[PDB]
Amino acid sequence: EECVFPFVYRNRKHFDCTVHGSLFPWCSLDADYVGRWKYCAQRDYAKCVFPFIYGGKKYETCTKIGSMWMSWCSLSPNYDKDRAWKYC
Amino acid sequence: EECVFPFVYRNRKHFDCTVHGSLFPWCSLDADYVGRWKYCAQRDYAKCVFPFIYGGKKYETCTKIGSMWMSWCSLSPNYDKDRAWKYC
Amino acid sequence: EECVFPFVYRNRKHFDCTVHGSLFPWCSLDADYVGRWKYCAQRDYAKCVFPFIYGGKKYETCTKIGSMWMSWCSLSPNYDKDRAWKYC
Amino acid sequence: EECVFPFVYRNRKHFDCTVHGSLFPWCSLDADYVGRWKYCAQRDYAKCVFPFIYGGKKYETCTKIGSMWMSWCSLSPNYDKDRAWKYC
Numbered sequence: 532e533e534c535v536f537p538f539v540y541r542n543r544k545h546f547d548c549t550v551h552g553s554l555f556p557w558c559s560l561d562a563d564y565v566g567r568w569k570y571c572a573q574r575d576y577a578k579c580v581f582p583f584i585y586g587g588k589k590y591e592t593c594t595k596i597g598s599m600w601m602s603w604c605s606l607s608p609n610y611d612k613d614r615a616w617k618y619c
Numbered sequence: 620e621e622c623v624f625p626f627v628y629r630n631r632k633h634f635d636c637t638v639h640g641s642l643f644p645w646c647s648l649d650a651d652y653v654g655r656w657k658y659c660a661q662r663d664y665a666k667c668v669f670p671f672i673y674g675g676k677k678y679e680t681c682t683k684i685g686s687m688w689m690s691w692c693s694l695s696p697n698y699d700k701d702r703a704w705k706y707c
Numbered sequence: 708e709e710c711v712f713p714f715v716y717r718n719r720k721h722f723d724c725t726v727h728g729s730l731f732p733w734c735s736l737d738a739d740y741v742g743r744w745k746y747c748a749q750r751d752y753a754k755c756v757f758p759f760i761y762g763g764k765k766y767e768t769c770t771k772i773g774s775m776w777m778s779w780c781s782l783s784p785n786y787d788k789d790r791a792w793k794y795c
Numbered sequence: 796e797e798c799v800f801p802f803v804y805r806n807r808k809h810f811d812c813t814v815h816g817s818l819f820p821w822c823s824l825d826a827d828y829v830g831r832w833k834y835c836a837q838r839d840y841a842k843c844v845f846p847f848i849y850g851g852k853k854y855e856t857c858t859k860i861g862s863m864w865m866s867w868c869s870l871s872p873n874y875d876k877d878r879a880w881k882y883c
């Protein structure tokens with residue numbers, strides 16, 4: 532099945548596939564981990580979440596604001612809160 | 620005679636042939652072990668139980684979900700409860 | 708694809724899935740290993756080969772001859788030569 | 796500009812963005828590195844090359860064969876020769 536982001540595993544919140552406790556990226560099929568997980572294929576990795584809030588401002592695309600080198604995007608609607616992100 | 624699954628032997632519940640107390644896999648001929656048993660041949664091993672509950676969801680076939688290597692199935696109607704399984 | 712039995716891997720001949728160099732049973736998809744392999748599902752394990760030669764005699768079913776406890780079968784047409792077998 | 800795959804840098808052939816000589820993945824803008832390069836964004840990474848030769852066989856799609864974890868594809872027409880790949 533599909534990955535559920537974010538998911539909580541051992542009290543740790545994940546907004547993307549993780550190598551936490553693994554040799555290969557995996558994701559939970561449930562927000563609250565109950566034993567269902569799978570290794571991640573390219574399509575399974577978390578995609579940019581638009582729009583997202585950063586510094587109290589709304590972003591509709593990848594941005595260099597707050598980075599100034601490589602554009603990035605949030606992996607949740609509110610980066611200020613979750614701080615989950617990835618380079619684009 | 621025929622294996623009875625699950626069977627209880629020395630405080631352990633077995634849903635398949637076991638090496639519990641032996642070198643070669645065996646099974647009890649009674650739900651509650653009372654001295655009747657036999658060594659398991661290929662046909663004696665437990666078969667998949669469908670459907671089965673896993674991660675609070677109903678599965679009608681084997682699944683690769685939750686396994687680091689191969690598709691598997693529960694050996695009881697409720698894997699979450701019994702945790703008994705085999706690869707497919 | 709399908710397993711090829713027997714297959715040679717690092718000069719070792721295998722007539723069934725093996726854990727040789729692995730944490731889980733696997734098989735080569737080519738008689739002469741060239742990098743193609745897969746983990747084995749139940750259907751992939753080597754099945755009895757009938758008829759098979761043992762002690763210069765032909766066997767059409769699993770036999771206890773030469774064992775006298777649990778019936779077994781060869782995993783190749785000529786056990787005398789290959790010595791590959793499994794309990795039935 | 797755009798990545799050129801494969802590209803040669805300091806005696807190494809790269810069929811995808813690389814961390815060779817850096818902390819962040821990059822790629823040469825020329826087959827033979829001559830000073831033109833850029834850091835890779837998601838879109839810059841090499842894409843699967845179909846069909847590709849693997850184990851002397853022709854593959855038209857990604858395959859789980861040969862991988863301990865995930866389906867993959869070659870980054871060149873001949874994996875046996877180049878050994879360049881990526882997960883799918």
Ligand SMILES: C[N+](C)(C)CCOP(=O)(O)O
Pocket residue numbers: 551552553557566568
């Ligand atoms: C980390 N993992 C989810 C890939 C495997 C271990 O899972 P679990 O044994 O904590 O349920």
Ligand SMILES: C[N+](C)(C)CCOP(=O)(O)O
Pocket residue numbers: 596597598603616
């Ligand atoms: C997400 N980021 C680290 C790339 C840039 C924003 O950084 P910060 O202002 O939240 O520290």
Ligand SMILES: C[N+](C)(C)CCOP(=O)(O)O
Pocket residue numbers: 629639640
């Ligand atoms: C002896 N042993 C502890 C390894 C296994 C079987 O013990 P028991 O619980 O059946 O008495």
Ligand SMILES: C[N+](C)(C)CCOP(=O)(O)O
Pocket residue numbers: 684685686687688689691704
């Ligand atoms: C534990 N399980 C029944 C969910 C799956 C089998 O686990 P694994 O040992 O193949 O990774």
Ligand SMILES: C[N+](C)(C)CCOP(=O)(O)O
Pocket residue numbers: 727728729733742744
């Ligand atoms: C043993 N194995 C085939 C599962 C993996 C290692 O394969 P290889 O690296 O010798 O080609």
Ligand SMILES: C[N+](C)(C)CCOP(=O)(O)O
Pocket residue numbers: 772773774779792
């Ligand atoms: C195959 N076997 C070991 C079960 C019985 C035959 O043994 P052997 O006569 O080849 O030694």
Ligand SMILES: C[N+](C)(C)CCOP(=O)(O)O
Pocket residue numbers: 805815816
């Ligand atoms: C320095 N290093 C050996 C770790 C990696 C890069 O070396 P080089 O071959 O590019 O000169």
Ligand SMILES: C[N+](C)(C)CCOP(=O)(O)O
Pocket residue numbers: 860861862863864865867880
């Ligand atoms: C090496 N390969 C390209 C055949 C497959 C990937 O290997 P693995 O590291 O996922 O097991």
